[PDB]
Design a binder for this molecule. Sequence first.
Ligand SMILES: [Cl-]
Ligand SMILES: [Cl-]
Ligand SMILES: [Cl-]
Ligand SMILES: [Cl-]
Ligand SMILES: [Zn+2]
Ligand SMILES: [Zn+2]
Ligand SMILES: [Zn+2]
Ligand SMILES: [Zn+2]
Ligand SMILES: [Zn+2]
Ligand SMILES: [Zn+2]
Ligand SMILES: [Zn+2]
Ligand SMILES: [Zn+2]
Ligand SMILES: [Zn+2]
Ligand SMILES: [Zn+2]
Ligand SMILES: [Zn+2]
Ligand SMILES: [Zn+2]
Ligand SMILES: [Zn+2]
Ligand SMILES: [Zn+2]
Ligand SMILES: [Zn+2]
Ligand SMILES: [Zn+2]
Lengths: 471, 471
Amino acid sequence: VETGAFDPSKPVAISDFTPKEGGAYQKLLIYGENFGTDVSKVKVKIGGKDAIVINVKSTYVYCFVPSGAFSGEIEITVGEGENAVTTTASTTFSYEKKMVVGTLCGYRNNRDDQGWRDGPFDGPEGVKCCGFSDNGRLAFDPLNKDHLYICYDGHKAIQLIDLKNRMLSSPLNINTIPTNRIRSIAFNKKIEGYADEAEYMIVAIDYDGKGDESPSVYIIKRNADGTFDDRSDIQLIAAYKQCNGATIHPINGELYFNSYEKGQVFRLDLVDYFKTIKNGGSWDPIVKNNPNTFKQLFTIADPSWEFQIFIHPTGKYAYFGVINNHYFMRSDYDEIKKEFITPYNFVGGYKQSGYRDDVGTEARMNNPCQGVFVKNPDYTGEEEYDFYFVDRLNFCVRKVTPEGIVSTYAGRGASTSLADGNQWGTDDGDLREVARFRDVSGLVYDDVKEMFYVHDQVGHTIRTISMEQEE
Amino acid sequence: VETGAFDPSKPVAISDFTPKEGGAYQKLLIYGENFGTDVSKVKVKIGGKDAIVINVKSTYVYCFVPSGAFSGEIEITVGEGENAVTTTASTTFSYEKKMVVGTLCGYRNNRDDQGWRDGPFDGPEGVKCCGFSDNGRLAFDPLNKDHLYICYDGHKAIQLIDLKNRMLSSPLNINTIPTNRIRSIAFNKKIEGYADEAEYMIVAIDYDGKGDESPSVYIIKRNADGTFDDRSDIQLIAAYKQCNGATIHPINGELYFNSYEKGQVFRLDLVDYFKTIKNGGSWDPIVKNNPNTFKQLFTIADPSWEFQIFIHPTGKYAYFGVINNHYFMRSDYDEIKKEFITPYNFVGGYKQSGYRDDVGTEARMNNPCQGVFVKNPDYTGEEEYDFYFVDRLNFCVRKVTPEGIVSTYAGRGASTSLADGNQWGTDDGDLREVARFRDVSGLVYDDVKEMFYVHDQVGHTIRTISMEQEE
Ligand SMILES: [Cl-]
Ligand SMILES: [Cl-]
Ligand SMILES: [Cl-]
Ligand SMILES: [Cl-]
Ligand SMILES: [Zn+2]
Ligand SMILES: [Zn+2]
Ligand SMILES: [Zn+2]
Ligand SMILES: [Zn+2]
Ligand SMILES: [Zn+2]
Ligand SMILES: [Zn+2]
Ligand SMILES: [Zn+2]
Ligand SMILES: [Zn+2]
Ligand SMILES: [Zn+2]
Ligand SMILES: [Zn+2]
Ligand SMILES: [Zn+2]
Ligand SMILES: [Zn+2]
Ligand SMILES: [Zn+2]
Ligand SMILES: [Zn+2]
Ligand SMILES: [Zn+2]
Ligand SMILES: [Zn+2]
């Protein structure tokens, strides 16, 4: 062989590589000897995973770090058959793990005829659980994050996704609720003299069968054994019409709920409710007849405005997600009055659906659904959180900084959307290169395990976003 | 007056505001009393600067924090004439200063007939200095950052911008150089036994008047009094043809220079040069006849490739800015051989001019010129720098992260480009809302004062990017 050509009678050596650490898709430069000058004659594995070889030039090889290369062991084989020579680098590459999309439970077969079935997360079709097909919202039991509840707009049971025993059940059949349009789940904060922390599940429903005296919000009391099920006491706490959600202030504990009719936002101090029942009184849930107790703070925009309220963990502000008109508004909280004030347009285009990462009202989204605040360790001032939400008709999770910069966090996998031409899909893995979702409606974040659970309504699955693990 | 209306017989009060700190363009919420409900009747000043009032609702006012509101004093006046009532908040807003574009020296009058004139940075037209009209490059004297040199492609003097005495001079008339196409300025690193740190200015020129034996690089020796001027010894160190720049490796000290002909990159160890002259030898600068001394490492792409070399402060890699074909390539440095290796496309589109912030080869630029590496305090690993370059025909400074994300750092002011419809201009101030440049060719960064100097070739000015200051 000539100068620079591969010599199969001599060893192949790796002397160094750079960078020494990195994540999947990182370009890696490997230095050594006897690599030859042809990509076709070189194969590289990193952490036991086959790696894409970019260029080979005698004393160096460029390749891409593969997903899941945990061990960082670098192995190279030059030549083929009788002439193949292999070596392994003496030091390991330091693989930096990334968040990845996974699938927890649920499935959709080729005929989409699996239906609904309670049971184990895993097993053969016919045994493993499935359903999850109506638009939904997620909420953890604040006293036990192994218990993840899901409510649905179109399925009249609130289900329990039990992460510890890996079982799906339907403990809440809410038979007295007059509709299957269940919109949200919240829990009370402790109320001195009246209610322990999360003793009550607060459930919003979307109904207008009794005109403007139609139920909006119910309250369900935890059983003596700690469960929420059909033995639980359930009471009507507010009735107007067309409610799309109810949310609890994380510091002061009052309840905010709306009506789509004119986009009203109502404020209820639960102390009024518990004080009345404690003194053997009759509670009147008819909002219109009691303007001092169910205080109407404002209308956020125009009539027929469908939205939910997401309050910052400090309680100092909230985002109002306008599901049917494709934007979020922001509202500041007056800490002395203990009320939110008239909101203003924050991110997205007023009545203009689309998909565009940009700043403020130049960003575009399409049917924004559930959102959550997540601590960003890089923030050091008084603002410590970013906001993440499922953008339903764009099949992804978006991120919103406090300044209003909107980006795409997970979904619409670049490589997978090329293979089949669809921005939607079921692929697990790398957040923006591979992973895909179908219509996404629900989202929660476990702030201790540092992971998201996502309700993929049209995939009929519960997905996860969490740190990859060596199996 | 009714409930919520302004009452001119009562004081106006400010009780609180949020956020407590922030920068220009921040939305500020001011709480208080007696503000009325009309924006037309309210005026706000912050730090003595008039502020844009957004919304007024009796007990709160929303406004934008103005540029230059250093003192943070909040003053509000409600009403007019005899009914005007003013109050000042008892606590000050904490104004966070930002980088701003400024103009150091040079000017362009309405007839663009000021020409060239050495002298003071300030004064009346006819006295204050001007010129700066040919495409240029900037370089500090490594031993004195008060001395900023500028060389020009089309003006046969190298000028001194003396930041201490605020005077422009022309100390280097380089009479023996055969052209006015001066392309770059560099300085040697200390060479044990031969040359002290920055004892020599290394100057690249663009010439082909003697075919392939045409001068490319000269070396100019510092005078006994520390100056570089017409008393300085000047020698030809390399001659091929069509050189576009020469750069010194910041750790090992060797010299890299190119030729546009085939896009060659040549490597010269200056020790060879000084050893020859020290021993009473004759130095032969003809590159073609001495392939072992002027080592040709590679050709970077196709023929007729105009580019400069920008080496990372660690010396571990370099970016090659292809001026005439609108992209940057990246080259890794082999620390054992002490040579760069064949480069690869990094950011921008190969032969595709444009303006687009994006990742890698999806980004678009137009005539990328001088670039500099700048430490980012947020980076904690082995990579501590970002890269900034002047994108000439896009009238701005762009930023390139090590991963290849290209953004716009300064220029193309949003508000000013609306007023007149031009992306170019002369405005000073806010980096992306107001400031504008015309064609930009030169760029340096003082890593101690934390400021950039920019050569705005068509504005005929030297601009600054630095922290705003209370005058
Ligand atoms: Cl072979
Ligand atoms: Cl929706
Ligand atoms: Cl008035
Ligand atoms: Cl140019
Ligand atoms: Zn090495
Ligand atoms: Zn080949
Ligand atoms: Zn159902
Ligand atoms: Zn359980
Ligand atoms: Zn109790
Ligand atoms: Zn009635
Ligand atoms: Zn207040
Ligand atoms: Zn825009
Ligand atoms: Zn206050
Ligand atoms: Zn008015
Ligand atoms: Zn001139
Ligand atoms: Zn001086
Ligand atoms: Zn000396
Ligand atoms: Zn000759
Ligand atoms: Zn080497
Ligand atoms: Zn793209």
